[PDB]
Design a binder for this molecule. Structure first.
Ligand SMILES: [Mg+2]
Lengths: 295, 296
């Protein structure tokens, strides 16, 4: 079983230091109504590092409850740099109705390839729901090698692919050339189309928070092999895809959602904070050429 | 400022049947004290802080404080986090358990901006009254505390007295001490302990000192006494072991070396950390043959 297509790494809106549960639910329904195939609660874009275990439960339960009765899947973030914790978060995400888990590579402690294998093997054997690996070396300080990804894909039934955020289209070829049955997912919006055109089967997008219809159309154009139309949308989105990373994700996207009136307060949890006034103006200017769907 | 400097050891955390070997933990700390170490760093990066429970962090810090009582050895407890509310709690938690100061690593993974790093450490410094040492290791965190950010935190926050640098950037070490010579630059990379000390650094937080505490202590104290010839002499002799202790990610090689030297009973890690490859196991054993390793 797999979870693919156009997917959104959901932001986590805050109101006076607390999770805005009403805004969280209405933001997910806005994603559902704009053709998004799955939502990723408490991911990296959702500020998972600063959320309590209770708040992660609430965000996952809201996502599951909002997506019931639709095709939209819930791919909950449940990674950790401690394997015993990552196993607990995986079991915790399943108990709350998630269709699958996105489990980031252990950050900071830099496990070896052997350790990465044993880390994910313990996670996969703890649940019966699909597990999508998440490789983002710029954040974690380590890399899940192609061989390690392929071994985990072949040895673990529920591990069905990887979300790549590594700016390495060479590795994307390497992955799908040696194991074309895995689901390569783009975790980097600017290169959504090149990953999809090489056989990638979906994206986990940051831009889709603001422009879910455009990311969805891009993905489904690519899945129907209409690469001209898929590339066109990807080219159209390049400016917004880069300006959403002038500061660290999710600082720009939350700023954009606030500027569009899609979230009610521009609140982060430290060490995340508001962007500079120069980047605030940059985001506000680039957004003006994109039509932002309302509620 | 209240400072904690000198030769310091990032203590490994020995495991036995998946649990912290507390008796071994105390014995290893005593071995560090008896070999001239000026401070010990419990539940740091080398101590596998990522996989220790909150209670296990308490036990390790208290054991270090208890073992160091009656000596001049300070306890600089690791108490960092990528969530500011948690890092504040861990800083206060470290103070409650008798730590002399805290080593607070830059928030990992979520890559805060320099403005966010400033507010992150400012909240930590205003939560306790013990010294706070910054820890910049961009290869692990994915972010860098800029020289300007470190200097602002040093000047604006009373308890922040310096930074443990593990960035392979001797240029930044010059940049730091040239613009703020009052701060305590601490070497977080054993191979370049002497270059950092010779530029005005006032201590090291060492991985090699777990295995060779007498050599790291003599190196550091030679440099602090401005005997740079003897300090460099030790640094050059230590280069081979300093590099092989990172043939795999810290603390995989150092724990392997401690096991090979008979200093710990079992070569146990907590996943996602694991034993090294058998080739690197032999390479570490090969390099150790050059060095005299103190017992207990
Ligand atoms: Mg069709």
């Amino acid at each position: 079983n797999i979870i693919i297509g156009a997917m959104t790494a959901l932001i986590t809106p805050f109101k006076n230091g607390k999770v805005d549960e009403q805004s969280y639910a209405r933001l997910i329904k806005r994603q559902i109504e704009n053709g998004i195939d799955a939502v990723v609660p408490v991911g990296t874009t959702g500020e998972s590092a600063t959320l309590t275990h209770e708040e992660k439960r609430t965000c996952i339960e809201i996502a599951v409850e909002t997506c019931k009765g639709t095709k939209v899947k819930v791919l909950a973030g449940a990674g950790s740099n401690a394997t015993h914790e990552a196993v607990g978060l995986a079991k915790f995400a399943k108990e709350h109705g998630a269709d699958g888990i996105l489990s980031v590579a252990p950050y900071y402690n830099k496990p070896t390839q052997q350790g990465l294998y044993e880390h994910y093997k313990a996670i996969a054997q703890s649940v019966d729901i699909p597990v999508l690996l998440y490789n983002v070396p710029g954040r974690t300080g380590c890399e899940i090698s192609t061989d390690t990804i392929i071994k985990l894909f072949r040895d673990c039934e529920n591990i069905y692919g990887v979300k790549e955020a590594s700016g390495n289209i060479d590795k994307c070829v390497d992955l799908l050339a040696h194991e074309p049955r895995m689901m390569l997912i783009s975790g980097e919006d600017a290169i959504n189309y090149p990953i999809l055109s090489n056989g990638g089967k979906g994206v986990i997008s940051v831009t889709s928070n603001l422009l879910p219809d455009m990311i969805s159309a891009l993905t489904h154009f690519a899945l129907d092999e209409n690469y001209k139309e898929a590339k066109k949308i990807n080219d159209e989105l390049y400016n917004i895809n880069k300006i959403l990373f002038c500061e660290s994700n999710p600082i720009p996207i939350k700023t954009a959602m606030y500027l569009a009136g899609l979230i009610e307060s521009l609140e982060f949890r430290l060490p995340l904070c508001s962007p500079s006034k120069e980047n605030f103006a940059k985001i506000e200017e680039v957004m003006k050429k994109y039509k932002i769907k309302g509620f």
